[PDB]
Amino acid sequence: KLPPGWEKRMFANGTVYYFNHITNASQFERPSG
Numbered sequence: 240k241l242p243p244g245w246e247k248r249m250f251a252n253g254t255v256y257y258f259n260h261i262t263n264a265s266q267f268e269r270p271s272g
């Protein structure tokens with residue numbers, strides 16, 4: 240689904256984002272869109 244090292248995440252308010260476990264980077268929008 241996601242590009243290398245990326246996975247789906249979510250804030251405690253119910254808002255969804257993307258996070259990279261290899262580099263600790265994050266985006267609100269889909270990585271390599």
Ligand SMILES: *[C@H]1O[C@@H](CO)[C@@H](O)[C@H](O)[C@H]1O
Nearest residue numbers: 250251252253254255256
């Ligand atoms: C959840 O709410 C968002 C919109 O206010 C943003 O502030 C953040 O992703 C979280 O705090």
